[PDB]
Point group: none
Chain length 63, copies 6
């Protein structure tokens, strides 16, 4: 499963995830479309999802 | 503190660091100019420098404390 | 200490040298057990060691 | 070169390998003359060689 | 110069050095942390490293020049 | 014979040995009681005794 989708699963919605991270919903869409969450947002997603997804899942090329 | 410079000095030269990472010297020079190594190269740098620099020193905006 | 040994000291560890060459640590260990590095790795060793360990020291039979 | 020979190269000498295994140098020499190491020494050889010389290479009849 | 690190690198890893001396890895890590191998292990280290380090390098306060 | 006792034989007294080494008489007693001269004092004892006892006699586990 895609790591972003896991994060959406945990937050319950695109708007809730976006608000949780302080980013635009368009950002989350762009991340899903490009197949890349920004490296600098990985810890924040690991945090807001309470560990449902971790950094190495989001960006194995970085972590 | 300039983590990129510590890394260059650990290997001994920009050439040696570039070689150790499989990149062009110009890439290292660019990272240094902009003060930012690519996130996906931080572990590699930590490894080739034998831990003389660590990921959090290279990209504190990416790695945890 | 032989050429491999000093290449390792230069990089600081087997881990660091393996990473610098794009090989597994186990490959370095195998080279040490054989007593020599593959010819095809010598150029890269010379580069990543900042010239401290040169091709002709690694493989005199190849590089003279 | 066989497994014993490369274990010796890895450690650097018969002295160094004997010391690393807690055996007399004469024991190493005896193993070489027999053509194989005792099964009970294979785990330690694998360890002290940093994995370069593994049990199954030393004693295929035991370790496969 | 760090004689303990030269010894670790000669064997290839802390595990291999520990094995060669019949000690726990934690012992090697402790020696390194405190910058001092036990006097009674110096000859053993000199032997297992095939002389890549010698007793006087390990414990200059114990061995002669 | 005990190596420390040989050293005392050579220096002539506990105080002379202690002074020769720059240590407390209590140190020499402790060394005798514990059955261990400090490794870092072996060369000094070999020196002050002019070779009457040598390092390998004092600490065969070290030398
Ligand atoms: Cl032999
Ligand atoms: Cl190794």
């Amino acid at each position: 499963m895609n790591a972003i989708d896991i994060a959406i699963n945990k937050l319950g919605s695109v708007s809730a995830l976006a608000a949780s991270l302080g980013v635009r919903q368009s950002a989350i869409s762009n991340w899903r479309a490009r197949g890349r969450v920004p490296a600098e947002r990985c810890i924040d997603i690991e945090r807001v999802t309470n560990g449902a997804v971790i950094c190495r899942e989001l960006r194995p090329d970085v972590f």
